[PDB]
């Protein structure tokens, strides 16, 4: 499932053991964006506008924590557009799904977002954003025509 | 006066060439932009794998 | 044949002009450079006053 969200996105959950769980659209205190992580600090500091404390020392015991498999997941090239035009949390893929089945899913929909007399500049700007990664030399050209 | 009569003719040829070229320019842009949108739909998209170490910034 | 003979005339004029210019260029450079060295010698030099505050950088 995919869902469009408002930028900037910051989430910081204080965990009970003293670490913090972070998911954020932007970097602070070295923490990478977009991928979530469990964060711990040796000394109290301010990050994302709030104080990450050093935890109290703990005594070790036998663990029963689960260890899930890792997983690599491919998404459609335009996933941000597909989530956007729905306005709701929408199913985009399955864990196992082939390249071909994944593509034939939104294609007819996406093709029917065609160029119109009323919003050509807006449409051209979206084409540039979509083309940027594929053909940078075409995206800069389309951007210039769009601002003209 | 022959130059004036010749000017009225040369003018109407450059005015005609002006419009025929605009017809071509717009017709080409609509073709290309639409094709590139088609191509953009079918390119391979991104991969995620939750690996923090891969996304470190120094 | 006539082209070779004519080429030989036009060539010798351009080759003559080429050298007469090089003579001038070198002769000018030596004049100007030596005068500028004279001028450089006679310009006012720096002032010192042991004031640390004057040489603060922020």
């Amino acid at each position: 499932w995919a869902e469009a969200v408002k930028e900037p996105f910051v989430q910081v959950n204080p965990l009970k053991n003293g670490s913090y769980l972070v998911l954020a659209s932007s970097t602070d205190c070295q923490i990478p964006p977009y991928v979530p992580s469990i964060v711990t600090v040796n000394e109290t500091t301010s990050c994302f506008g709030l104080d990450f404390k050093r935890p109290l020392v703990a005594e070790e015991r036998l663990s029963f924590e689960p260890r899930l498999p890792n997983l690599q997941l491919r998404l459609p090239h335009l996933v941000g557009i597909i989530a956007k035009i729905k306005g709701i949390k929408i199913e985009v893929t399955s864990s196992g799904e082939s390249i071909k089945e994944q593509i034939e899913r939104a294609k007819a929909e996406l093709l029917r977002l065609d160029i119109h007399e009323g919003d050509t500049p807006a449409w051209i700007q979206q084409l540039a954003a979509a083309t940027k990664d594929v053909w940078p030399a075409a995206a800069s050209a389309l951007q210039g025509i769009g601002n003209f | 006066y022959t130059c004036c009569a010749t000017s009225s003719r040369v003018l109407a040829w450059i005015f005609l060439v002006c419009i025929l070229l605009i017809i071509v320019l717009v017709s080409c842009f609509v073709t290309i932009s639409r094709i590139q949108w088609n191509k953009d739909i079918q390119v391979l998209g991104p991969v995620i794998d939750w690996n923090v170490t891969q996304r470190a910034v120094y | 044949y006539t082209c070779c003979a004519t080429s030989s005339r036009v060539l010798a004029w351009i080759f003559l002009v080429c050298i007469l210019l090089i003579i001038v260029l070198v002769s000018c450079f030596v004049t100007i450079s030596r005068i500028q060295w004279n001028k450089d010698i006679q310009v006012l030099g720096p002032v010192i006053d042991w004031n640390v505050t004057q040489r603060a950088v922020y």
Partner: peptide
Amino acid sequence: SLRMQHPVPKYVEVNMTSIPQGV
């Protein structure tokens, strides 16, 4: 007289770990 503020280095240690599948 001249009074100045020289920056001096320091660090905090931050550790990070992954969450497979985001679970």
